[PDB]
Ligand binder design. Structure first.
Ligand SMILES: */C(=C\C(=O)Nc1ccc2nc(NCCCCCN(C)C)nc(NCCCCCCN(C)C)c2c1)CN(C)C
Length: 212
């Protein structure tokens, strides 16, 4: 069937859609198609390109209320790489508290982690019941399942600025230095190339966690 309304969705609404690049982009919902219990959502992107998407591959063009975000919520979040802004899918790992300066911790589908504000989040429209089940990277998927279902039990390493450890990157270990701690993240400086990364303190990419 061709629908105009489906739950809280309405044809003609502004929406975010996931492209083949894995980045998300503004568009308009132009059709809703059902095949039995299955539902697909046709999006016309602002560049006039069209794609037929599953409901976990569209997100609302508004920010979720705080009381609708939980550990395990499926979101699109802003990631600023340099002066470029991308919208990328992830999982809420932490909700605002004193220790994180009232921010949301996001674990992105590509393994990166960041603290963001509510204004940097968009809810995915039709997430899977087990929200991690559409994470393509199996390693990341398994990590998320374990994290979300064990929460609030979260093994983490205790580090401070100046400590020297090895940190994993693309399957090898690198000499590194702890630059900064911010809540559940540590900023690691890779000594070989002097590039840095915020890494979750429970990541086995950190030597002490790997060795624990
Ligand atoms: C460190 C500063 C510094 O290095 N800053 C910095 C700026 C931008 C960076 N961008 C990226 N991008 C990678 C892709 C991200 C995709 C995110 N998704 C869309 C959600 N990565 C940066 N760093 C990652 C770590 C690289 C380590 C390389 C290791 N090497 C030995 C091979 C990144 C960093 C502090 N200064 C030096 C004082």
């Amino acid at each position: 069937e061709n629908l105009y309304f489906q739950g809280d969705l309405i044809v003609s609404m502004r929406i975010l859609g996931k492209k083949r690049t894995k980045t998300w982009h503004k568009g308009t919902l132009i059709a809703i198609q059902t095949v039995g219990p299955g539902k697909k959502y046709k999006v016309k992107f602002d560049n006039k390109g069209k794609s037929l998407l599953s409901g976990n591959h569209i997100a609302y063009d508004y920010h979720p209320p705080a009381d609708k975000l939980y550990v395990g919520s499926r979101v699109v979040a802003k990631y600023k790489d340099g002066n470029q802004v991308w919208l990328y899918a992830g999982i809420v790992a932490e909700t605002p508290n004193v220790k994180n300066k009232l921010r949301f911790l996001i674990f992105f589908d590509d393994g990166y982690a960041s603290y963001v504000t509510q204004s940097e989040l968009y809810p995915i429209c039709r997430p899977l019941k087990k929200t991690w089940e559409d994470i393509e990277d199996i390693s990341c998927r398994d990590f998320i399942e374990e994290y979300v279902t064990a929460y609030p039990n979260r093994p983490m390493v205790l580090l401070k600025s100046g400590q020297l450890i090895k940190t994993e990157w693309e399957g090898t270990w690198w000499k590194s230095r702890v630059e900064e701690v911010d809540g559940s993240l540590v900023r690691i400086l890779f000594l070989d190339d002097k590039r840095c990364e915020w890494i979750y303190r429970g990541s086995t990419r950190l030597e002490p966690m790997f060795s624990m």
